[PDB]
Each structure stands twice: as structure tokens, then as C-alpha cells.
Write a protein that binds this ligand. Structure first.
Ligand SMILES: [Mg+2]
Ligand SMILES: [Mg+2]
Ligand SMILES: [Mg+2]
Ligand SMILES: [Mg+2]
Ligand SMILES: [Mg+2]
Ligand SMILES: [Mg+2]
Ligand SMILES: [Mg+2]
Ligand SMILES: [Mg+2]
Ligand SMILES: [Mg+2]
Ligand SMILES: [Mg+2]
Ligand SMILES: [Mg+2]
Ligand SMILES: [Mg+2]
Ligand SMILES: [Mg+2]
Ligand SMILES: [Mg+2]
Ligand SMILES: [Mg+2]
Ligand SMILES: [Mg+2]
Ligand SMILES: [Mg+2]
Ligand SMILES: [Mg+2]
Ligand SMILES: [Mg+2]
Ligand SMILES: [Mg+2]
Ligand SMILES: [Mg+2]
Ligand SMILES: [Mg+2]
Ligand SMILES: [Mg+2]
Ligand SMILES: [Mg+2]
Ligand SMILES: [Mg+2]
Ligand SMILES: [Mg+2]
Ligand SMILES: [Mg+2]
Ligand SMILES: [Mg+2]
Ligand SMILES: [Mg+2]
Ligand SMILES: [Mg+2]
Ligand SMILES: [Mg+2]
Ligand SMILES: [Mg+2]
Ligand SMILES: [Zn+2]
Lengths: 111, 53, 116, 101, 49, 144, 154
RNA sequence: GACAAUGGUAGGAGAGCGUUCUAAGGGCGUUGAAGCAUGAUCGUAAGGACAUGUGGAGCGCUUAGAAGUGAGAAUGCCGGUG
RNA sequence: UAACUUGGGAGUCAGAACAUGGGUGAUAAGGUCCGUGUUCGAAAGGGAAACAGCCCAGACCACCAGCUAAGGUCCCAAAAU
RNA sequence: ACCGAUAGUGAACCAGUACCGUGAGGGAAAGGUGAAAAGCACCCCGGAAGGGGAGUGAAAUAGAACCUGAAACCGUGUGCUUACAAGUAGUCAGAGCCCGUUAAUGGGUGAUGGCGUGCCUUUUGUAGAAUGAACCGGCGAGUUACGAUUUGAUGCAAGGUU
């Protein structure tokens, strides 16, 4: 049985978010929580909140036992991009992409 | 100097082969059971080497 | 009345891309470079339908030469002897015989040597 | 036992009960066809035609009159705005060898 | 005659030629004008006579 | 109708031969050995697979040259460093490394393909009359 | 066209040096929002043919009706008031097809008004006969007076 | 049935495919239109069907008529994304 | 087996190598300019290692059939150690 | 037998607006929930954003730039495959492995062998180290009027035609 949670339009670049997701994909929930708490990257607290929300609805909506759950899926899709500019020398402007991520966590009991 | 040819997906991902981070060096706190960074105070319980900090 | 571009363009480009299925990278993905490769594929296939006949005749001749030398005869003299004997078995059949039953090929070789 | 038969400007090595594909014959499905050009008969008793084994025959049953898989013949000459695309399906006759001689 | 079965007299109608619509027509690209010069230009060509 | 036999690894049988270089001309021995290694002597020759046999060449040190090749045939190599040409004469190479002489002569008569590399790896050359491959039970092969 | 589209007076950027394609107006045809090249322009599609051919065409359509047996001659229409129901009954009793062209000698107000709302029924006069109406109809229902007038004219 | 021809740039000639709209006839569609997606389908080519999924209200076919009727390139224009 | 006449529609007016008859140049040039022929241009296929212009030869489509051309036949690499 | 949101007005929308310029002046982008707002009570994780249930609804995979939702491009998983090899990336030949279709002398992959220097433009000649294109999508070029000439078609004909 599976439970899902999504954080949509997090203002962090998907490349960056996926660096951290690659660490927790497929691990036990408690180990993943520890990894996120002790990994020093900007997306760790956000990913942690997605994971805790998924575990919470595993417990509440599906009465799953949270101590048997594994991170079955973890991934970041691209959200809409905020388009910005930076003034450069000699009157020119250059684009700045403030990218966003949709972060999905799926936890599973394997049954 | 500028790229003479664009970089293919294959080449970009080959280059990114080694672009990754590692799991932290962490162990279970002997006092409270929570994970901690080795050689660091445990933030959950504030203990290090069996004593409060 | 105005005729907007519509669907024909996408339909045509999709046909070309699907024809490029299996190609490397951009060549199974982007219409222009897939079109180019599909063109090259057509030209190559036309050329190779002709080259394949040459190639298989060459393979058959090599196998016949090996069999003949096993019977102490060169390919050239074996073919001359078969011609003089009136035997019209082509190189494909001669090779397949040499592979599949040596006794029949030995009889053919004896016919050739007798003709010479 | 096998035979070398000539048909459709080619030569085919056949054994009884084998399915073969040849250039379209002028026959109907379910008919019996007779190959009268036997160049060679091999096996226990070997017969060498010069060119044809006299009186030797191979009978077959016509299973199918089909058309080969589509070939897209495409050619072009670069920079000359010159290309040509054609389709082709080569007719064929599928038979099963019943009897040699 | 019927309005759903109209037919012009044989040979009375012919489809117009359209240039500059691809190589297969034989009037693609240069659209039958050849290559360069005054006569290849939009509005080009000398006065009659 | 397609009926051409194709060898594949399930039905290929590679034998072992021994060929004596003594009294043989380098190039002529070499061309015959190369044919053997490629399998051109088998009725089941199939170009996209190795249908050849293993060859051991003995008495490589007794291979012979005609003319003045012993002193005048020069083997050059380049180290990919500027001015990095090195040369060795055919006679000196026969003196100091006859195995290499025979091997390069034969391998130069094999295609520069992955398959040609593999086929050339089935060659074993020895300067003397002994080889360490009694376990493979090789048969003597007479040239020509 | 490029002249009629609003704006576009100035050259968008200098001819040389910028690295861009040269452009002369933001309203050129390859520009989004630009002027249209050629395209429709108001005009008439009407043309003429010789009068003898007009008459031959009318006769040919009428003869085609007469040969397909889609010509019914009636003595007269004695309609005092418009009544679609009565005209519908008259058509059914005459056993007419769905598409009927009714021809009167002159404008017949009551016949026109009674037939006006019936799908497939068109009304005309002898003078008003035309190839499209005749050809479209499956059957023609013509009064004797109208038939004589048509015969006179053609 | 025979046997003759069929490389091709500029360019001439011919026969066709497809797009939007109109007329007439004849049809389809909430028991699911168009569009989109996938498929191992058919035609000598342009291209034409069929099945399933998505979609949720319009669309084929025949004959004829008319054109803003077909893009891969213009340091093309606009948008999106590398 | 063409030819000519009349009418509708063109494109073309930068040519190249090779061989050969000549001028020019220096019996120089992958030079330049005329005559003659072929090929390329607008011609794929085989040979000449690769190689528009050389040698063979003009591809309507299909075949895992046969004979030849130039050129070849020890191995690469088909065919004479 | 006019357009249908890159079209049609510059402007379907709070447009001569935003924005740019000292000024004259230049000058955009931007339409669509649903039949009905019935526009998600309540519970749960979270500071919030966001989400998972529950419910409304025919549909929420119609939940607010909310009909459909192509491509480029970015991810996750996986059947086959790959770390001795020299690649215009295919084509022809071909084992092994994995599948099973509009059922067709099937589909996916590809050890290994032969052959093979993109396309367009412009050129005597271009793999060219000449030009052009980052990619994908949309848009983007012989038209119309009036005369002339020729051919086809049709009507009438020493007449034909307004
Ligand atoms: Mg400044
Ligand atoms: Mg329209
Ligand atoms: Mg378009
Ligand atoms: Mg041939
Ligand atoms: Mg046409
Ligand atoms: Mg042409
Ligand atoms: Mg073009
Ligand atoms: Mg012209
Ligand atoms: Mg041009
Ligand atoms: Mg010109
Ligand atoms: Mg630039
Ligand atoms: Mg406009
Ligand atoms: Mg020809
Ligand atoms: Mg023309
Ligand atoms: Mg257009
Ligand atoms: Mg472009
Ligand atoms: Mg000359
Ligand atoms: Mg030219
Ligand atoms: Mg021969
Ligand atoms: Mg050989
Ligand atoms: Mg607008
Ligand atoms: Mg739209
Ligand atoms: Mg506008
Ligand atoms: Mg919806
Ligand atoms: Mg939507
Ligand atoms: Mg390896
Ligand atoms: Mg290959
Ligand atoms: Mg030049
Ligand atoms: Mg330059
Ligand atoms: Mg230029
Ligand atoms: Mg460029
Ligand atoms: Mg583009
Ligand atoms: Zn602790």
C-alpha cells in the first residue's frame, strides 16, 4: 500500500532538489528522515516536510504502520519558471531563470 | 572561446556522472537512539560521549 | 477563405520521426535531422539491395573454393570442369551442397575432373 | 533426399514437406504444381543433371499467392532538388513440396 | 442535370499551375525563373521592344 | 529463396595446428597462416564470425628471406613523440625477437577489425622447436 | 497589406552591425502582426454569356424536367386566402416530390404566401424562371397559362 | 499476346494527392464529433483507413465550384525550451 | 529514323578536365586563347588506395540466379602461389 | 463560398493603455471552470505554500489564465545492450536474449561483418576550412483588376455581340 505527498512550485531549481532526492530514494522512512536532517543542502527541510506529510497521510488516511514504510518513489519535476533579468555592463541585460520544482514522495509498506 | 557545437544529452549526462553528493557520515546516538553526525554533539538530546553539552 | 496551417504539418513530420525510430539521440527526435537520416537510409538501402547480391555471390564462391581445395582442386578449375561437364548448378546451390552433404559434392568434383 | 529445382530465374534446394517461396507462378491456391527442371538429386542415390535430370520431377502444393513486404525505394541527389519515392511489393508463390520424382 | 452531379464539358476546364510549392512540381524554389539576373527579380525584366 | 548457411558459435569447431617455419619464406608462410586463422579454408566460412583455427608456428628463428631483406628491410615505428622514429632491420629483428617478426608479418595480412584482432589473437609463435600447448593436441599442418 | 497595417513607418534597427537580420518595417509580411501578401481583395464574381446560350440553358433544364417526367400541368390555383395547410394538401394530392417548383403566369400572392413556409417548395413566375430553381426542383408544377407564356417566350 | 522505351540540373508538358470554404445529394455523432496519442494496416507517390486510450460537440462522404491551399532553410518574425 | 514549317512556353550568355591541332607564355603552369573529340556540368554503378573532368559502363522496380567490361586472381580482398 | 485569438482593428481583455522618448513620436502582451458556483463543510501533515482524504459535480485526471493539451526540453522505472574501442551514426548481413501483433514468409534489442565524408544555397568544381539554420511550434513569398495574345470549351454563323 502506498501514500503520496506533493509540494508544488517550490522555489528551488530541480537540479538542486534532485541532488538530495537521489540520497533518499528507496530507503527506509526513518533512515531517510535522518539523511534529510543531517544533509546540509537548501532543499533538505522542504523534502523532509514532503516526506513527513506522506508518512502522516499513510498513518491517517490508510492506517499504515509508519515503522515499516520505505521511500518507494522520490522525484522532482519542473514547475513554472520565474523570468528575471540582471543588468550587465554597457546597458545590456541578461536573463535569470528562477526555477521551481514539484516534489513528490511516495511511501510504501510493500504489501 | 565559445562552444563550437552544442552539448548533446548523452555528453552532458556522462559529464554529470560524478556530480552528486554523498550520504552524511552519521551514526545512531548511543544515548537517545537518533541519528547524529559522528564526532558531533547530538542535537536531539544534546549529548556527546555520554555527557550533556 | 483563409486556410490556417492545421494538422497536415504535424501528421507529415510525425511520419518521418516514426520512420526514424531507433536512431541515436536527436535523430529519432527532431524532424529535420530525422528527415535527413531517413533520406540517407533510403539511398543506402537502394545501394545495398544491389550490393547484397554481390556479397552473397562472393560468400558462395569462397565456400566453393574451400570445398574444392579439400578435394585438391581450385575453384577456377572446378567451375571450368563443371561448365565442360554441362552442370548448371549455381554457386549458392554448390555451396549449400558442399556444406550439407560432402558425398554429393565429391561426385560433382569427380564429374568436373572427368570433364577436364 | 533433396533436389535442386530451377524456377523464377533461380535455383532452390528442396526436401519433401518443405515450404518454399518462389517468383509468382501461374497457378491457383490449392492447386498442384510440377517442377520439371531438376538439376540434381542428392541423398542415398545421387543423380547429376547435365543440365537437367531427365524425367525427374518435383511436385508441390500451392499454399499461397502473396505479395512481399513493402519496400520504400527512395533516392535523391543532394543539392540538385532531385529525389524519387516509390513503393514495391514483390509477388510470390508459397508452396509445400509433396514428392520428389 | 442535377446539382449533385454537375460536370463541365470535357476539356473546357484546366487546373491552374502553382509555382514555388516544392521540388516535385518542377516549379519549386526559383519558380521557373532560372537563376539570378534581371529577369529573375520581382517586377524585373526589360521593357518590351 | 534465402538458404545460405550461417555459422555461429554453437556450430563452430576450431582446431589447433602446428606449422614449422624452418626453411620457409616469411611472406608465403605468413599468407597461408593468415588464411588458416581467418577460416578461409572451411566450407562454412562466415564473414561476421571467427570460423578460423588456432595456429602455432615453431622454429620462427629459422624463417628465411630472399634478396638483401636481412639488411635492407627496415621496420619503422613512431612513439607519437616529436622525432620519435625508431627502426630495426628484418635480420636484427629475426635475431632478437623472431616471434614478433612472424606475428607482425601475419597480423599485417589480417583485416584491421575487431574480428581481425580476435583472429590474430589465435596465433602463437615460438623461436625454438617447442611450444607449451601439448594440452591442446595440435596437428601438424603442411604448407600449400 | 503592409501599407494598410497600422504603424511601421520607421526602420526597426540599423542596416548593419547589430548581428540581426536586416529589416525595414515591423509590419513586413514575415513579421507577426505584419501586412498580408496578396490575399482576398473585394471583387465581383459575376460574368455574362451570350443571350442565345441563356435561352438554350433554360430550354435544356425545362426539357430535362419533361424527360424525367417531373412536369405537371395544372389548370389553375384558385386560392382566395393564403393557407399553408391547403397548399400542402394540394401537393400531396398531386403526389409531388419533396422539392417542387411552382410556376404561375404572374405574381400570385396567395399561392406564394401559402407555399412560402413549406420546406422544399419554391414559387416563381413564368418570367422569373431560372436554371438554379428549375434544376434544384425535383418536379415542376406549372399552370396552363404559365406554360403557354413560357412557350411563347422561349 | 508480342517487343520497345523509362539517369537527369535550368526548363517545357501531363496526371494526381492533401488543406479551408460553398452548392446539391447522401450520411455519421453523448451507445461519444473534431483534435491529440499509440499500433505489427493499405496504396506506385503525395497520402487513405481501422483499433484502443484521451477528449466532450461537432464532422465525414460523392459530384461540382472557389482559394489567405501544403515550409526546412530568408544572420526570416513571435512564443517556448535547451 | 529522322527532318522541315507554323504557333504556345522556356531556360542559357561564369564553364571544367582529359586527349589532340595551333597561337601566347619559357616546346612553364591545375596558365591563357582558338580548332576537333570525349566526359563532368546534369551521371549513379565497377576500376584508378582515397580522387567531378581519366578507363569501363548509362541505375523503371524486386531476386540469397547466370555471362561479361575496364581492372584483376599470395593475404588484407572475389578469382591462377 | 470575409477573420476566428501569432488571424481579424494596434486594441475580442479597463489600449492608444503598460512601456520607451526632452519632445514630436513609437507602441505591446493578455480570450475559454462548470449546465448550475453547486467554487471543495470536516479530518490529517505543514508557520505558510502545498498536499492526502472526505464531499459537490456527469467529469475535479473541470479546483481558478481552471475546454482540449502537440513538440522541443526535463525526470522516475524498466526489457535488450555497452568499459581493447577510431564512429555524418545509417544501411545491408547477422547470432544471442526478451516479447507476441491491424497474424503478417511478426515486434524490441543488437555480439560481430560489408558498405558509407549531413542538408540547403552557390558554384567549373563544395565533406568542405564558402553561405545559412541552437532546438521545437506557429506565422512567412507569382496574387487580384483591367487590357493584349494564344490554346481548349461552348453557342450562333456571313454574321457574331451588346
Ligand atoms: Mg548605464
Ligand atoms: Mg475559414
Ligand atoms: Mg504553417
Ligand atoms: Mg550484378
Ligand atoms: Mg499540379
Ligand atoms: Mg525541373
Ligand atoms: Mg528548399
Ligand atoms: Mg520559365
Ligand atoms: Mg537563388
Ligand atoms: Mg536568366
Ligand atoms: Mg549570432
Ligand atoms: Mg493582421
Ligand atoms: Mg536507363
Ligand atoms: Mg510547366
Ligand atoms: Mg500560404
Ligand atoms: Mg528559421
Ligand atoms: Mg575544347
Ligand atoms: Mg550549374
Ligand atoms: Mg565466369
Ligand atoms: Mg580470395
Ligand atoms: Mg491581436
Ligand atoms: Mg488556440
Ligand atoms: Mg497586435
Ligand atoms: Mg476536462
Ligand atoms: Mg486544461
Ligand atoms: Mg569489450
Ligand atoms: Mg555497420
Ligand atoms: Mg570559386
Ligand atoms: Mg567566410
Ligand atoms: Mg554570400
Ligand atoms: Mg550559423
Ligand atoms: Mg523555425
Ligand atoms: Zn542523542
Amino acid at each position: 500500500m502506498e501514500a503520496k505527498a506533493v509540494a508544488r512550485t517550490i522555489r528551488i531549481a530541480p537540479r538542486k532538489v534532485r541532488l538530495v532526492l537521489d540520497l533518499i530514494r528507496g530507503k527506509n522512512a526513518a533512515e531517510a528522515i535522518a539523511i534529510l536532517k543531517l544533509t546540509n543542502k537548501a532543499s533538505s527541510p522542504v523534502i523532509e516536510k514532503v516526506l513527513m506529510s506522506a508518512l502522516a497521510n499513510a498513518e491517517h488516511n490508510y492506517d499504515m504502520n509508519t515503522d515499516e514504510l520505505v521511500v518507494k518513489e522520490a522525484y522532482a519535476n519542473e514547475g513554472p519558471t520565474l523570468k528575471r533579468f540582471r543588468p550587465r555592463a554597457q546597458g545590456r541585460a541578461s536573463a535569470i531563470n528562477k526555477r521551481t520544482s514539484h516534489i513528490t514522495i511516495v511511501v510504501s509498506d510493500g504489501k | 572561446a565559445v562552444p563550437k557545437r552544442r552539448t548533446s544529452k548523452t555528453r552532458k549526462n556522462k559529464r554529470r556522472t560524478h556530480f552528486k553528493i554523498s550520504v552524511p557520515g552519521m551514526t545512531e546516538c548511543p544515548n537517545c537512539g537518533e541519528y547524529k553526525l559522528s564526532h558531533r554533539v547530538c542535537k536531539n538530546c544534546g549529548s556527546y560521549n555520554g555527557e550533556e553539552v | 477563405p483563409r486556410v490556417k496551417g492545421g494538422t497536415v504539418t504535424r501528421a507529415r513530420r510525425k511520419k518521418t520521426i516514426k520512420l526514424a525510430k531507433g536512431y541515436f539521440g536527436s535523430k529519432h527526435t527532431l524532424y529535420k535531422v530525422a528527415k535527413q537520416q531517413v533520406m540517407k537510409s533510403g539511398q543506402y538501402a537502394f545501394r545495398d539491395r544491389r550490393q547484397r547480391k554481390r556479397d552473397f555471390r562472393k560468400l558462395w564462391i569462397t565456400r566453393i573454393n574451400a570445398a574444392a581445395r579439400q578435394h585438391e582442386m581450385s575453384y577456377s578449375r572446378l567451375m571450368n570442369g563443371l561448365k565442360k561437364a554441362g552442370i548448371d548448378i549455381n554457386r549458392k546451390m554448390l555451396s549449400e551442397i558442399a556444406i550439407s552433404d560432402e558425398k554429393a559434392f565429391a561426385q560433382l568434383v569427380t564429374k568436373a575432373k572427368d570433364a577436364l | 533426399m533433396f533436389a535442386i529445382i530451377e524456377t523464377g530465374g533461380k535455383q532452390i534446394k528442396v526436401e519433401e514437406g518443405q515450404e518454399i517461396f518462389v517468383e509468382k507462378l501461374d497457378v491457383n491456391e490449392g492447386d498442384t504444381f510440377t517442377f520439371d527442371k531438376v538439376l540434381f538429386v542428392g541423398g542415398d542415390s545421387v543423380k547429376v543433371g547435365a543440365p537437367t535430370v531427365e524425367g525427374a520431377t518435383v511436385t508441390a502444393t500451392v499454399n499461397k499467392q502473396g505479395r512481399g513486404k513493402k519496400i520504400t525505394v527512395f533516392t535523391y541527389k543532394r543539392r540538385k532538388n532531385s529525389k524519387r519515392k516509390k513503393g514495391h511489393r514483390q509477388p510470390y508463390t508459397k508452396l509445400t513440396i509433396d514428392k520428389i520424382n | 442535370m442535377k446539382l449533385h452531379e454537375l460536370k463541365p464539358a470535357e476539356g473546357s476546364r484546366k487546373e491552374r499551375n502553382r509555382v514555388g510549392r516544392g521540388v516535385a512540381t518542377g516549379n519549386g524554389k526559383t519558380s521557373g525563373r532560372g537563376h539570378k539576373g534581371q529577369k529573375a527579380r520581382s517586377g524585373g525584366g526589360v521593357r518590351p521592344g | 529463396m534465402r538458404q545460405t548457411f550461417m555459422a555461429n558459435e554453437s556450430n563452430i569447431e576450431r582446431k589447433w595446428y602446428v606449422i614449422d617455419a624452418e626453411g620457409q619464406t616469411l611472406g608465403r608462410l605468413s599468407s597461408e597462416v593468415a588464411s588458416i586463422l581467418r577460416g578461409k579454408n572451411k566450407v562454412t566460412y562466415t564473414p561476421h564470425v571467427d570460423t578460423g583455427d588456432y595456429v602455432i608456428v615453431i622454429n620462427a628463428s629459422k624463417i628465411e628471406f630472399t634478396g638483401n631483406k636481412e639488411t635492407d628491410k627496415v621496420y619503422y615505428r613512431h612513439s607519437n613523440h616529436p622525432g620519435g622514429i625508431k627502426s630495426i632491420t628484418a635480420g636484427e629483428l629475426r635475431r632478437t625477437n623472431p616471434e614478433r617478426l612472424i606475428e607482425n608479418s601475419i597480423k599485417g595480412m589480417l583485416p584491421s577489425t575487431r574480428l581481425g584482432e580476435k583472429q590474430g589473437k589465435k596465433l602463437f609463435v615460438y623461436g625454438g622447436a617447442e611450444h607449451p600447448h601439448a594440452a591442446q593436441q595440435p596437428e601438424n599442418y603442411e604448407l600449400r | 497589406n503592409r501599407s494598410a497595417v497600422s504603424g511601421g513607418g520607421r526602420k526597426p534597427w540599423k542596416q548593419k552591425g547589430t548581428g540581426r537580420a536586416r529589416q525595414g518595417t515591423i509590419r513586413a509580411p514575415q513579421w507577426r502582426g505584419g501586412g498580408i501578401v496578396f490575399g482576398p481583395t473585394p471583387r465581383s464574381y459575376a460574368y455574362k454569356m451570350p443571350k442565345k446560350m441563356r435561352r438554350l440553358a433554360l430550354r435544356s433544364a425545362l426539357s430535362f424536367k419533361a424527360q424525367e417526367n417531373g412536369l405537371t400541368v395544372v389548370d389553375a390555383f384558385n386560392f382566395e386566402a393564403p393557407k399553408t395547410k391547403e397548399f400542402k394538401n394540394v401537393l400531396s394530392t398531386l403526389e409531388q416530390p419533396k422539392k417542387v417548383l411552382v410556376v404561375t403566369e404572374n405574381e400570385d400572392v396567395n399561392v406564394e404566401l401559402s407555399a412560402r413556409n413549406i420546406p422544399g417548395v419554391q414559387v416563381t413566375t413564368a418570367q422569373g424562371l431560372n436554371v438554379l430553381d428549375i434544376t434544384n426542383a425535383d418536379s415542376l408544377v406549372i399552370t396552363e397559362a404559365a406554360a403557354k407564356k413560357v412557350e411563347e417566350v422561349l
